[PDB]
Amino acid sequence: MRIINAEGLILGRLASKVAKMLLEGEEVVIVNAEKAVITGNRDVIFKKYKQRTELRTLTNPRRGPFYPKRSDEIVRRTIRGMLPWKTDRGRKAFKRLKVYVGIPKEFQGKELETIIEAHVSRLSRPKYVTVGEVAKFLGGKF
Amino acid sequence: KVHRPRRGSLGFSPRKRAKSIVPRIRSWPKETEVRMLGFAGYKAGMTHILMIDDEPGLTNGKEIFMPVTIIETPPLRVFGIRAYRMGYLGLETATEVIVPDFPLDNYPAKERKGKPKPKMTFYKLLERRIATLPKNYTQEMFEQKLGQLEDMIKEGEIVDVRAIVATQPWVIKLKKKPEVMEYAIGGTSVEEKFNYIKEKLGKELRVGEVLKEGELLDVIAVTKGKGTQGPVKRWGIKLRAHKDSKGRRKVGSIGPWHPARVMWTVPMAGQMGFHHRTELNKRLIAIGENGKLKLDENTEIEITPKGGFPHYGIVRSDFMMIAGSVPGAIKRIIRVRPAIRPPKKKPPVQRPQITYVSVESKQ
RNA sequence: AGUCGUCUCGGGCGAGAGCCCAUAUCGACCCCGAGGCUUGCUACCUCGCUGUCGGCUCUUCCCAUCCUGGCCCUGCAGCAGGGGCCAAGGGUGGGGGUGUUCACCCAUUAAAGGGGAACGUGAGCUGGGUUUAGACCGUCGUGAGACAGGUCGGAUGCUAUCUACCGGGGGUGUUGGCCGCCUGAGGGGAAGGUGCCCCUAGUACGAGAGGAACAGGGUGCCGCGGCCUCUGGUCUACCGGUUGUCCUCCCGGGCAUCGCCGGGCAGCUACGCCGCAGCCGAUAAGGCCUGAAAGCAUCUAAGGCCGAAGCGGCCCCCGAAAAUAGGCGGCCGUCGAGGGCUCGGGUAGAAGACCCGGU
RNA sequence: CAAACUCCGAACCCACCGCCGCCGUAGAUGGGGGGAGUAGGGUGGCGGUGUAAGCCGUCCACCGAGAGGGGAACAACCCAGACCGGGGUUAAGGCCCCAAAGUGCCGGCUAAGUGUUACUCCAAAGGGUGUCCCGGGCCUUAGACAGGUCGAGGUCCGGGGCCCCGAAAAUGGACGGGGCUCAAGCCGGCCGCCGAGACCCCGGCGCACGGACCGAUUGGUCCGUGAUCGGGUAGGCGGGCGUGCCGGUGGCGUAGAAGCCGGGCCGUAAGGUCCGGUGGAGCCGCCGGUAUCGCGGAUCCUGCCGGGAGUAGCAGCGUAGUCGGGUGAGAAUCCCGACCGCCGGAG
RNA sequence: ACCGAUAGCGAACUAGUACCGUGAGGGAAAGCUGAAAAGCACCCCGGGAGGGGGGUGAAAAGAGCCUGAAACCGGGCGGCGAUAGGAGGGUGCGGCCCGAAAGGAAUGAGCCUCCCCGAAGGAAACCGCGGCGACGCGGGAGUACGAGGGGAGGGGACCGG
């Protein structure tokens, strides 16, 4: 079981790597989902996430896309999008993932893995927003 | 086309039978003073009074008619203390301590032909609600559990504390099975709240001690049941044209061609009544003691109308007289809490000047 | 369905009109586009059958916004106007003729916006118009007859198979079972919208006429959720009067809509009565601060502040099947806690379910 | 300026002659005979016509009548034309995850989520000290501009790349999705690796042609060539499988025939034959003839049986029964008595 | 060299019979016990119909009678079975189950070990050099491996289906 600290990691690249790990039968625990970054323009990102949230089924709200508003849920859904969610293999792979905000005491005092292929040092300009900021704008718990 | 507001509100859906006949309180007000935030009673009936208006408005200082509702309020029994810690996604109960069995004195025992008095005790009426209570639970065990809870609070894992209370329908002779409720305590410091609950554990609380006359409250109860009701009564649709040969009390079209489904918003028949409802900003006109209301320090009147309240007995214990109507059939359990979203110019917190009280036969 | 000639709506240039001044406003002659809301063109799907216009009922969506919120220019003194920007949470009503959509007109109103949904909606209704079979008038035809010319009459089938939405129940699972109290991931909300009145004030402004606003109070209407103390309806429980007839007459009864008539408590009702937050956070249009590119200037390129009835929360309703399938106290198990039927009743109810009581 | 003009005039097309190449004595060009099907075509490039869609011809490339690998699905676009069992390498194109293969390399650009679109689908006129560049200029490093003083480059013009405004729609939502900013976008290139039934190889089948040998009715065994054989609708042609009966020939059966249910084997197949049950009386191989000779459809015919369903209906025009007793295995429904009712110008 | 009970005349039989229409006229369905009725004597239960024993018969073939298919329904058995999406199938294999005969097999099955030749194809460790770099060039080497074709040793019951 590998534990990844998401602080200062690009959301999409972290999600790609974590999904690749999951598809091979490895348990993963992301411990700082609120500190992931998303490059782009703040207004565009916020508008996109608001549109995702307001997506819903007209005939019955109890069936429409339940896109997330929390940071950990956002990271979870981002990773899910990269898995074959419609297959038993993809469902079993997703059942092997846990995402948390901040470091819970349970995972305290344990090795934290980082992904060099997704660190913010790659970016030429740090024009991004945090998943925590996106959640705050959306009105989620954290 | 001609526009108009839609029939009924979508903010109370689904319109289903209430989960529990005992109402639940989801939110509590923020008060600096340390006191229990609400009370419980039984709905008795309705009457009217004439009072000099003190609330701001055009009718200020002038005698006015005012309908009032009576809730019989036997004293509550504080028999538990519960603690809440902060979980990952919200509050989670950490521990809960109930007092050990003690004799029950306010039980109205009757001497029937043969056998002695029943000699009832606590944990005997409570079994009718719980059915699984501690055995061989002693004062020392209770003391050690309370000490453990206090040590947890000192450590700081506890973020909130609340009181477990029980109703006593037997004292007023309504029924015997009690209703158990969980009440938040006003204040800021968990230590103060814990001391306040501890000093009253195993004792009685009176609405006179809890609430204040002339204050605004919110009333929570389950409304009267109506069974299955058609859309005309459930949502208020308009009757169809009188020439209709397929009925009059039904919706005409339940949707267009596309979407090729019935939208959930189309009015339809179903359960009406017996819903959990909250009514805001109801003034507490008066609190009466032992079924008697005092007017001018030398006049007291029985609050029970001649012949008794319809479908109800006689008010014999403390009671609350509140302005306006409240949800629930007769004898329903009604919860009251302090005003959660009160206005800015509130009425004075004191009993108004009541010039007349109606006690004429209401049947 | 394709296309947009036409239709609706934008843009480029600026001759000219505006006392001068092209751009306050209008904008010739020309040119470039958007939508698929008018009509047309094509004939691609549907003629071993997909029922039309209009109205009623009901649901939902777009902004190119009529009013309601906030702004910019003005040939914007005030009160009002003209042009434009952000903004779709709410409203956009009642009537006369006509089958009418539309258009015209009347009295109110803040306004009485245009449209999409198989020109939404006939296994929901109506059938006035349209389009059979009967008949009359005008015109055309020798005639039988015809008329996208009037006129009168002219039927609307349903036992829900699957799914859909509205409510009501029985199970499994959630690493043993059971009773109780909770947490709140998520979904729903308009739970609120909008006028008028009093003061500010006959004040600012203005020669005068005329005539505001911030703030502070009151109240109406529309909508929503509850209640039956008061008033009204009903009240085939109940009491009384009375007509015809029958039980032989008297009492007391049957039938004649409950025979008819008047009153009527409980219950249900509205025509009755009670309740419905303006605060915080970030923003759009818009107003500013610092500052270079471009030694100056500059709201913008980097950066910062404020700023909408719109967005998120406080608030109300559903909510352990929330697959990370939850927390806690207690009881039981490794005969037995806790339940079901049966029993007397409604704080309930189509069957189930729920609630009180059971020596 | 010219479709109904031409002093000129191509690409290009056509006829003929010589040659290269290919095909042909295992028999072409050509000639005779038998049998057809086809007379609605579509996409794509070009021409006339139309606002456009579209209509009408032309080109024979693809679907029609075409598998496999891709473009998200897609007739028509890209690779590719296919007998059966295996191994390998490539094509279209692809390599951040979905998803096999690089978070690949160098130089530059974009800040718009522009884009992430080879074509089937893709918004314009007009404008931008937004950026990165090229070419011409005039002044031009104590002298040029910004505000006669400073004291380093200015001030124009015509262009090129990317981007920006111009840019409004109806259920919630479309780069295929997630997402992506020295890139997972776009330019000029490059290096590895994945990826077809295509290409190569091994074994097998058939077919066309030639040959040797061998059958007492169309033929059989084997051999040689096939880079120049192996998709297929209408249609043409050859072989084979199955059923009833007849003339022969050789047989099986009460120690169990036909028929019927479930299995094994052979055949690319139509099918045949064996094993284990039931059945109690007929049945088959081979040769040569004959026929009401082969079933999924025809809103096919006859018979049987399903879901709808233990559901609708057993109300409306006259809503009628109840209490004791009897009978009888069994009584709301039959019989007697009482009471309450209905028609009473017909019930 | 016709058919063999949905065929053959409409009628293999109480058939132009029963039935439909005022009428003229139209017009079906329906064969089989056994060699011999030897067609179930007696007993228990049941109101009865019939059920269970027990007898007859080579065989119930039991009269609702030669055989008794399919559709459809009920029970047992084996598999799946209440978080999972596609016209119900195709390729490959893995669980659970069956597996005497007809298929191989104790004259040796799956299986384990070793040896030889091998078409098309085809690496790397390491050494030297070129490139800014991804990487490439020469040797190693056409080597290990390679579809398939053979041989020897161990075990002793499966494999195919």
Curated annotation (Swiss-Prot), chain A:
For this protein, the record's InterPro entries field holds: Ribosomal_uL13 (IPR005822), Ribosomal_uL13_bac-type (IPR005823), Ribosomal_uL13_CS (IPR023563), Ribosomal_uL13_euk/arc (IPR005755), Ribosomal_uL13_sf (IPR036899)
SUPFAM superfamilies per the UniProt record, alphabetical: Ribosomal protein L13 (SSF52161)
Q: Which domain of life is it from?
A: Archaea
Transmembrane regions listed in the UniProt entry: none
- Cellular component aspect of the GO annotation: cytosolic large ribosomal subunit
Pfam families, A to Z:
Ribosomal_L13
Query: Keyword Phosphoprotein: yes or no?
Result: no
Enumerate the UniProt keywords alphabetically: Ribonucleoprotein, Ribosomal protein
Q: Name one GO biological process term.
A: negative regulation of translation
A single Gene Ontology MF term assigned here is: structural constituent of ribosome
- By its UniProt entry, which HAMAP family does this protein fall under? Ribosomal_uL13
Q: Tell me, what does this protein do in biology?
A: This protein is one of the early assembly proteins of the 50S ribosomal subunit, although it is not seen to bind rRNA by itself. It is important during the early stages of 50S assembly.
Report quaternary structure and partners: Part of the 50S ribosomal subunit.
Family assignment from sequence similarity: Belongs to the universal ribosomal protein uL13 family.
Return the protein name: Large ribosomal subunit protein uL13
Q: Which gene encodes it?
A: rpl13
Swiss-Prot record, chain B:
Protein name per UniProt: Large ribosomal subunit protein uL3
Q: Which residues form the signal peptide?
A: none
InterPro entries assigned: L3_arc_euk (IPR045077), Ribosomal_L3_dom_3_arc_sf (IPR044892), Ribosomal_uL3 (IPR000597), Ribosomal_uL3_arc (IPR019928), Ribosomal_uL3_CS (IPR019926), Transl_B-barrel_sf (IPR009000)
Enumerate the GO terms in the molecular function aspect.
Answer: rRNA binding; structural constituent of ribosome
An example GO biological process term is: translation
Q: What is the lineage of its organism?
A: Archaea, Methanobacteriati, Methanobacteriota, Thermococci, Thermococcales
Q: Which family does it belong to?
A: Belongs to the universal ribosomal protein uL3 family.
Compositional bias ranges of the Polar residues kind: 352-363
Query: What PROSITE patterns does its record include?
Result: RIBOSOMAL_L3 (PS00474)
Q: Gene name, please?
A: rpl3
Oligomeric form and interacting partners: Part of the 50S ribosomal subunit. Forms a cluster with proteins L14 and L24e.
**Cellular component terms (Gene Ontology):** cytosolic large ribosomal subunit
- In Pfam terms, one family for this protein is Ribosomal_L3
Q: Cite the entry's keywords alphabetically.
A: Ribonucleoprotein, Ribosomal protein, RNA-binding, rRNA-binding
Stretches for region Disordered: 341-363
Chain's role: One of the primary rRNA binding proteins, it binds directly near the 3'-end of the 23S rRNA, where it nucleates assembly of the 50S subunit.
